[PDB]
Design an enzyme around this catalytic site. Structure first.
Site, PDB file in Angstrom:
ATOM      1  N   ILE A   1     -15.303 -18.110 -36.889  1.00 32.60           N
ATOM      2  CA  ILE A   1     -14.540 -16.858 -36.779  1.00 32.60           C
ATOM      3  C   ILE A   1     -15.322 -15.875 -35.947  1.00 32.60           C
ATOM      4  O   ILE A   1     -14.779 -15.225 -35.045  1.00 32.60           O
ATOM      5  CB  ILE A   1     -14.318 -16.146 -38.160  1.00 32.60           C
ATOM      6  CG1 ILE A   1     -13.532 -17.004 -39.143  1.00 32.60           C
ATOM      7  CG2 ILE A   1     -13.654 -14.789 -37.959  1.00 32.60           C
ATOM      8  CD1 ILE A   1     -13.249 -16.301 -40.420  1.00 32.60           C
ATOM      9  N   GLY A   2     -16.608 -15.764 -36.250  1.00 37.07           N
ATOM     10  CA  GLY A   2     -17.460 -14.879 -35.477  1.00 37.07           C
ATOM     11  C   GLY A   2     -18.874 -14.859 -35.983  1.00 37.07           C
ATOM     12  O   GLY A   2     -19.318 -15.745 -36.706  1.00 37.07           O
TER      13      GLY A   2
ATOM     14  N   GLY B   1     -21.564 -12.397 -37.656  1.00 34.82           N
ATOM     15  CA  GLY B   1     -21.724 -11.156 -38.397  1.00 34.82           C
ATOM     16  C   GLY B   1     -23.101 -10.563 -38.233  1.00 34.82           C
ATOM     17  O   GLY B   1     -23.913 -11.022 -37.420  1.00 34.82           O
TER      18      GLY B   1
ATOM     19  N   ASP C   1     -22.116   0.641 -43.908  1.00 28.21           N
ATOM     20  CA  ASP C   1     -21.966   0.144 -42.530  1.00 28.21           C
ATOM     21  C   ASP C   1     -20.516  -0.125 -42.173  1.00 28.21           C
ATOM     22  O   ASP C   1     -20.186  -1.161 -41.592  1.00 28.21           O
ATOM     23  CB  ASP C   1     -22.872  -1.066 -42.224  1.00 28.21           C
ATOM     24  CG  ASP C   1     -23.016  -1.339 -40.732  1.00 28.21           C
ATOM     25  OD1 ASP C   1     -22.821  -0.426 -39.908  1.00 28.21           O
ATOM     26  OD2 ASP C   1     -23.310  -2.510 -40.390  1.00 28.21           O
TER      27      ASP C   1
ATOM     28  N   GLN D   1     -14.737  -3.733 -37.177  1.00 29.49           N
ATOM     29  CA  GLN D   1     -14.917  -5.133 -37.351  1.00 29.49           C
ATOM     30  C   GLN D   1     -14.970  -5.586 -38.795  1.00 29.49           C
ATOM     31  O   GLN D   1     -14.700  -6.758 -39.043  1.00 29.49           O
ATOM     32  CB  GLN D   1     -16.172  -5.604 -36.614  1.00 29.49           C
ATOM     33  CG  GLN D   1     -15.996  -5.758 -35.104  1.00 29.49           C
ATOM     34  CD  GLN D   1     -17.323  -5.962 -34.335  1.00 29.49           C
ATOM     35  OE1 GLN D   1     -18.393  -6.218 -34.914  1.00 29.49           O
ATOM     36  NE2 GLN D   1     -17.247  -5.837 -33.018  1.00 29.49           N
TER      37      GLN D   1
HETATM   38  C1  LIG Z   1     -14.700 -12.007 -44.878  1.00 34.56           C
HETATM   39  C2  LIG Z   1     -13.474 -12.369 -44.026  1.00 34.56           C
HETATM   40  C3  LIG Z   1     -13.324 -12.388 -42.671  1.00 34.56           C
HETATM   41  C4  LIG Z   1     -12.049 -12.795 -42.414  1.00 34.56           C
HETATM   42  N1  LIG Z   1     -11.356 -12.989 -41.247  1.00 34.56           N
HETATM   43  C5  LIG Z   1     -11.747 -12.565 -40.017  1.00 34.56           C
HETATM   44  O1  LIG Z   1     -12.814 -11.982 -39.843  1.00 34.56           O
HETATM   45  C6  LIG Z   1     -10.901 -12.812 -38.891  1.00 34.56           C
HETATM   46  C7  LIG Z   1     -10.829 -11.903 -37.799  1.00 34.56           C
HETATM   47  C8  LIG Z   1     -10.007 -12.145 -36.690  1.00 34.56           C
HETATM   48  C9  LIG Z   1      -9.255 -13.328 -36.635  1.00 34.56           C
HETATM   49 BR1  LIG Z   1      -8.166 -13.610 -35.129  1.00 34.56          BR
HETATM   50  C10 LIG Z   1      -9.315 -14.249 -37.703  1.00 34.56           C
HETATM   51  C11 LIG Z   1     -10.145 -13.983 -38.801  1.00 34.56           C
HETATM   52  N2  LIG Z   1     -11.433 -13.008 -43.572  1.00 34.56           N
HETATM   53  N3  LIG Z   1     -12.309 -12.722 -44.530  1.00 34.56           N
END
Ligand SMILES: Cc1cc(NC(=O)c2ccc(Br)cc2)n[nH]1
Ligand code: NA
Ligand code: NA
Ligand code: NA
Ligand code: NA
Ligand code: NA
Length: 287
Positions: free
Chosen positions: A10-11, A13, A118, A122
């Protein structure tokens, strides 16, 4: 971890990678974050801090000296939604709904003496029902807020309260109200309010908009650890110029969220009662 199949990354952090994953035991789709005994105890306490506007912490797994946090999965974050809404703007009723919901999440956590520290677009997550939820509540106290992330990325300063920048050792819940006020202004104007690229640039951007603080507006400010008498003295700007086309109620509320003195800054509970929310609704977002 053998109980989870990674679906995709997803990314990245602050503390580690974030994956979409499936729980084989229950079929559950989750967000799985890869991250000392004090931290385990602190983070374990967060499993009980449940509210509809707080991303649910499903589990904490400590294994092979690694820490995994298992969270409720949401399909979009506010940063991406703001970028995607750049050309047209997020409609005001939706901005208002989001702010109202985020204030509810803050009021709940604050009532339990838990700060975020924080907040940023995002870590605000959205669903197709019109809900918005706060992610990573309580993690800063457990782990600290570093200068750089685990991939060396710069941790943003844009939402940081002035008392933090001036070196206050003790944070109050007011730090979260400041951050949320900066986010509110960014949703309205489609540009970050205070996009600083160093601590002093962040501080001087705040001063150039809100005025350089002094003992009149913020008793004790000139004695703060990082305050210098050589700071330039800038005049305060009218919010009418800062966040057009926001109406008088919204500008009133924002001004109170951005008071310098944390003891003056509006609380989340008081903000919920503000006249700006008189006509609040829960629209369905476009997405
Ligand atoms: C802790 C948590 C994070 C989350 N999802 C995302 O961060 C997310 C952001 C953009 C896209 Br397109 C898909 C998923 N879900 N729960
Ligand atoms: Na779980
Ligand atoms: Na657990
Ligand atoms: Na942003
Ligand atoms: Na610092
Ligand atoms: Na309004």
């Amino acid at each position: 971890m053998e109980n989870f199949q990674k679906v995709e990354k997803i990314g990245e952090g602050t503390y580690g990678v974030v994956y979409k994953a499936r729980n084989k035991l229950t079929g559950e789709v989750v967000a799985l974050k890869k991250i000392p005994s004090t931290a385990i105890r602190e983070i374990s306490l967060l499993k009980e801090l449940n509210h509809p506007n707080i991303v649910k912490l499903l589990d904490v797994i400590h294994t092979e000296n690694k820490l995994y946090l298992v969270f409720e999965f949401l399909h979009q974050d506010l940063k991406k939604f703001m970028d995607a809404s750049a050309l047209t703007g997020i409609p005001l009723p939706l901005i208002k709904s989001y702010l109202f919901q985020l204030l509810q999440g803050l009021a709940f956590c604050h009532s339990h003496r838990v700060l975020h520290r924080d907040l940023k677009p995002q870590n605000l997550l959205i669903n197709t029902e019109g809900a918005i939820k706060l992610a990573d509540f309580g993690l800063a106290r457990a782990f600290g807020v570093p200068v750089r992330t685990y991939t060396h990325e710069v941790v943003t300063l844009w939402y940081r309260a002035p008392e933090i920048l001036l070196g206050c050792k003790y944070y109050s819940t007011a730090v979260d109200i400041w951050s949320l006020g900066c986010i509110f202004a960014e949703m309205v104007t489609r540009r970050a309010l205070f996009p600083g690229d160093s601590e002093i640039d962040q501080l001087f951007r705040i001063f150039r908009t809100l005025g350089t603080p002094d003992e009149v507006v913020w008793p004790g400010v000139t004695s703060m650890p990082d305050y210098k008498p050589s700071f330039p003295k800038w005049a305060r700007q009218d919010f009418s110029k800062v966040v057009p086309p926001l109406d008088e109620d919204g500008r009133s509320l924002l001004s109170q969220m951005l008071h310098y003195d944390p003891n003056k800054r509006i609380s989340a509970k008081a903000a919920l009662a503000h006249p700006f929310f008189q006509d609040v609704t829960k629209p369905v977002p476009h997405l």
